[PDB]
Design a protein around this ligand. Structure first.
Ligand code: 0TT
Ligand code: EEM
Ligand code: SF4
Length: 340
């Protein structure tokens, strides 16, 4: 069940890097169909005679390229910067914000020029030191879910672990963490899992690991000394959400029974969606029960980007207050980093 692509593209230039060569050798040996692409920013001939088909097939397609944009995006509130190791995901979460963010590039891209990327990360760390600089590695991908193929995240973990002022963090819905358990993280990596109510997981998170799988993985990473965290997102006011999210934290507490949870973090994100995201979702997941009724939402206008629908302030406050109380009840001492 670990992700393996059905189609792989290589940029010619990727072959000049160790990871490029390694991946080319691996995938040719596996007998996977391999193609050449002139830029990972434009891949041709992904199969499908319809949009939804090419979309589905794109999500089983890997592209091995070189990161040419070495300026890092901001990644608040998670981190100062997004470290670009991969883009895209094999998951099919109905609400996924990547459907607008990566609308046109739904294939999984991994970058092979780690030397360049880690060098630039160090430059950012240097520019702010002795202030701590955090990097988010899962801004635009499930980096953990694909990493068994590349070990790029493992390399990033060990790179950051060697710095004084750098810290790393990422979040996943995948359980395939075994190759990361012996990484020399040096306590500078927060390993997070996305969790949610039974309703949201069962109806909206196909193609991801089960809740039990995520928690089995969470026990493994805490066992290996990683700082642990959870991202409760998207917080979605389904019928019976109040008891739905109560049952989440109750089951969470039961699944972490007898563990050191002295440095446990929670991050809380309410469901959000853009106007372009709606009609996109409607034809990528035509039978979803996801509610995208804008009349049940308030519009938050954009600053540098486009705006989005979130819950009205009072309903958003109810969610925040309720999650905080459950976290206080079941995980005393645990730190809620933000609600948004
Ligand atoms: C995993 C994330 C990473 C992240 C992504 N992003 C970007 C990536 C993408 O371009 C966009 C999607 O709205 O959000 C961001 O600005 N800040 C982040 O912290 C996900 N997010 C989302 C939530 C919201 O859409 C946006 C800002 O809160 O980031 C978050 O707040 N916490 C995280 O830890
Ligand atoms: C883009 Se997700 C990338 C990392 C990894 N593949 C993962 O799924 O955890 C980052 C987080 O944001 C949430 N999230 C995704 N879409 C939305 C959304 N529309 N509203 C509100 N939240 C949304 C997801 O549940 C994740 O907790
Ligand atoms: S696992 Fe994360 S990035 Fe992948 S489809 Fe789901 S929400 Fe989107």
């Amino acid at each position: 069940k670990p992700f393996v692509p059905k189609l792989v593209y290589f940029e010619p230039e990727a072959l000049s890097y160790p990871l490029g060569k390694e991946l080319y050798e691996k995938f040719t040996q596996m007998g996977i169909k391999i193609r050449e692409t002139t830029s990972h920013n434009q891949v041709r001939g992904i199969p499908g005679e319809t949009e939804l088909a090419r979309y589905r097939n794109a999500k089983s397609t890997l592209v091995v390229g070189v990161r040419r944009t070495l300026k890092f995006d901001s990644s608040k509130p998670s981190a100062e910067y997004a470290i670009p190791l991969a883009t895209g995901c094999m998951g099919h979460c109905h609400y996924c914000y990547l459907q607008t963010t990566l609308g046109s590039k739904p294939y999984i891209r991994v970058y092979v020029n780690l030397d360049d990327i880690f060098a630039q990360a160090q430059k950012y760390i240097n520019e702010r030191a002795p202030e701590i600089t955090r990097f988010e590695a899962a801004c635009t991908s499930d980096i953990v879910g694909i990493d068994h193929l590349t070990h790029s995240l493992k390399k990033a973990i060990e790179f950051i672990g060697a710095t004084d002022y750098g810290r790393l963090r990422f979040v996943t819905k995948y359980e395939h963490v075994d190759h990361l358990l012996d990484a020399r993280h040096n306590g500078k990596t927060r390993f997070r899992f996305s969790i949610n109510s039974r309703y949201v997981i069962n109806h909206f998170e196909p193609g991801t690991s089960s809740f039990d799988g995520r928690l089995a993985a969470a026990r493994k990473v805490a066992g290996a000394g990683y700082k642990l965290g959870f991202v409760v997102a998207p917080i979605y006011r389904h019928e019976g959400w109040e008891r739905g999210y109560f049952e989440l934290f109750q089951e969470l507490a039961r699944q972490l029974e007898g563990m050191d949870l002295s440095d446990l973090t929670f991050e809380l994100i309410q469901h959000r969606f853009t106007k372009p995201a709606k009609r996109v979702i409607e034809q990528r997941y035509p039978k979803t029960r996801l509610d995208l009724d804008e009349t049940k939402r308030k519009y938050k206008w954009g600053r540098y980007g486009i705006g989005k629908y979130v819950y009205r302030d009072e309903e958003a406050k109810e969610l925040e207050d309720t999650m905080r109380r459950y976290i206080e009840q079941f995980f005393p001492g645990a730190y809620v980093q933000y609600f948004t």
